[PDB]
């Protein structure tokens, strides 16, 4: 701790201890009135402006502080479908500025959280931002800090949230650890496991080997889509079915996620899809405390009622047929 606090953090050794961490998720929610300056490309400009504001907040030395064009912001690259389809797509023998044997899906930089000289110390967090984005896949920004004031980072997050809300989107905060570990950390947290009413892997009304070869969790993914959820773990191995050019590693570490995670588009609830078809459902206490209980109970009812789940699965089968 004293070594990394003195500027000797370049040891490049995986320490067993972690600093203070915060994970923020950008979720497309709603376009504000006016601000015309299409509802599917203004969010592209919103993420571009957010990344530009983050990179413009880079911590700089006094020699670069006294001096006066900075480099352009890194590009965020968009695609449709699972991420492994895009990874098995870069093979194209054209260009070199396309996600470029571990693949760094994010990049990091040190920021200058207090610019105005409000604090007597030197404030310095570390931001991690992804290099990919989909309208159906939520966006990740990560703040890692060790000794910063936990109020300047709050108003920095507020400035980011306002900059988002000028455009569409909605910045939310989710716990860094997995949803499945909240009973193993916080025993008071609400956490319900869902064994849904109709098993699509063995029901006679919904069963096909070709569909399960194509998409094993097709009914569950469509159930989560129709109930208003966005995929959090975009880089997991439970939904896509393709190969890879060795493992992918984030700019902060290896993804140690047991199951795929989903965030409600409101930002209030977190779901998690297990291997055996069960689900985990919990509320986001940080959003509720910073800023509403009938929605999660209604989702539990839809996952427990046979008729409503049958209707959603029938809609999934009807869309699969047509």
């Amino acid at each position: 701790i004293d070594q990394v606090l003195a500027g000797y953090g370049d040891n490049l050794i995986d320490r067993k201890w972690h600093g203070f961490r915060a994970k923020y998720v950008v979720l497309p929610t709603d376009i504000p009135p006016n601000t015309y300056s299409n509802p599917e490309e203004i969010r592209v400009e919103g993420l571009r402006r957010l990344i530009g504001s983050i990179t413009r907040s880079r911590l700089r030395t006094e020699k670069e502080k006294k001096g006066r064009r900075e480099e352009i912001q890194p590009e965020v690259m968009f695609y449709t479908g699972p991420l492994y389809n895009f990874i098995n797509e870069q093979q194209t023998s054209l260009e070199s500025s396309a996600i470029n044997p571990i693949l760094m899906l994010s990049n990091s930089l040190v920021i200058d959280v207090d610019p105005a000289g409000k604090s007597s110390k030197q404030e310095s967090c570390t931001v991690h931002y992804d290099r990919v984005h989909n309208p159906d896949h939520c966006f990740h920004i990560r703040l890692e800090w060790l000794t910063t004031t936990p109020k300047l980072i709050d108003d920095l997050v507020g400035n980011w949230s306002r900059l988002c809300e000028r455009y569409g989107l909605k910045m939310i905060e989710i716990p860094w650890e997995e949803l499945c570990t909240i009973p193993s950390v916080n025993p008071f947290h609400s956490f319900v496991e869902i064994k849904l009413a109709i098993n699509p892997w063995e029901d006679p009304e919904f069963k096909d080997r070709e569909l399960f070869a194509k998409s094993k969790f097709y009914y569950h993914v469509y159930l989560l889509k129709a109930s208003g959820f966005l995929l959090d773990n975009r880089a997991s191995k439970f939904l896509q079915n393709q190969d890879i050019e060795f493992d992918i590693m984030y700019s902060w570490g290896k993804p140690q996620f047991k199951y795929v995670q989903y965030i409600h588009h409101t930002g209030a609830y977190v779901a998690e899809l297990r291997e055996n078809g069960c689900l985990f459902l919990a509320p986001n206490n940080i959003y509720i405390s910073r800023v509403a209980q009938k929605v999660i109970l209604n989702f539990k009812s839809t996952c427990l009622d046979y008729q409503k789940l049958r209707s959603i699965f029938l809609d999934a089968k009807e869309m699969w047929i047509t």
């Binding site: 504000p32 009135p33 006016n34 601000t35 400035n159 306002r162 900059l163 809300e165 000028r166």
Partner: protein
């Protein structure tokens, strides 16, 4: 110095006008209300002369309703208002704040200030300073806000401050206000802080004076109201609609001698005020 009142519909502009101005440069002129709804602004629709003829633009934001779109519209208005004329003072009133706590009021003002600053940073406007005042009809706040707005449009402010400070230092005056006969918008004072209680005392003294005079008419307004503790309140009409109300303390002296020296000093001050064309 004509000020333009702007805001969304049902924000309270007409009610503010009725309360203040109904109960040139300095007199309470017939101000212009402007109902601005959300729309796309037409580029230069013969509005350059109108905004060039406004001394200071005033914006009204309802704190009860949502106001992010209101701040966006305000930034859109400032975007051409500052471009047309770089000498306009810009004022924003956070109206309808009677039923809010002090912490909520301070947080709301801080949020409004930060949002306006961020929107002006996005629009690229620099060198602009927008003032903010927490106003409400039911209290003294709107009178003080209009007092500051009017004071920003009198170029002889510091000289009036020196004249009132010299008058106060030589007459044992606790606090002297240069009110206007209508709207109770005090124009100048001393370097002493404007106490709210003393301001309300002087304003209701203005009201008592005008009502009692209006009760007996059809046959230069002067008033001496002495309290039990010797503290006197004095009124003398200045040039045009201006009037002077001074809370003067006796400090254990003769009442009539203090009244005589105050009358002589205030007559001298009015003779000095005759030279400067601060009236109307």
């Amino acid at each position: 110095a004509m000020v333009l009142l702007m805001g969304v519909r049902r924000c309270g502009k007409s009610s503010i006008c009725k309360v203040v101005f109904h109960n040139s440069t300095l007199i309470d002129l017939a101000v212009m209300e402007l109902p601005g709804q959300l729309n796309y602004f037409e580029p230069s629709y013969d509005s350059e002369r109108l905004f060039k003829s406004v001394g200071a633009l005033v914006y009204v934001i309802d704190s009860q309703d949502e106001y992010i779109n209101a701040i966006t519209n305000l930034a859109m208005i400032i975007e051409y208002a500052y471009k047309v004329n770089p000498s306009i003072n810009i004022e924003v009133l956070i109206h309808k704040v009677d039923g809010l706590s002090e912490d909520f009021k301070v947080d709301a003002q801080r949020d409004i200030m930060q949002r306006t600053g961020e929107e002006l940073l996005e629009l690229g406007l620099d060198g602009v300073q927008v003032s903010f005042y927490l106003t409400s009809i039911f209290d003294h706040s709107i009178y003080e806000a209009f007092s500051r707005i009017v004071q920003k449009l009198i170029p002889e402010l510091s000289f009036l401050e020196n004249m009132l400070d010299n008058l106060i230092q030589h007459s044992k005056i606790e606090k002297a206000f240069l009110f206007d006969v209508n709207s109770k918008i005090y124009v100048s004072t001393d370097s002493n802080p404007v106490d709210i209680q003393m301001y309300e005392v002087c304003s209701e003294f203005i009201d008592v004076t005008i009502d009692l005079f209006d009760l007996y008419k059809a046959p230069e307004l002067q008033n001496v109201s002495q309290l039990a503790n010797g503290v006197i309140i004095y009124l003398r009409q200045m040039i045009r609609g201006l009037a002077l109300v001074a809370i003067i303390r006796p400090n254990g002296t003769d009442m009539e001698s203090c009244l005589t020296v105050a009358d002589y000093n205030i007559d001298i001050f009015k003779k000095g005020l005759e030279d400067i064309w601060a009236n109307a």
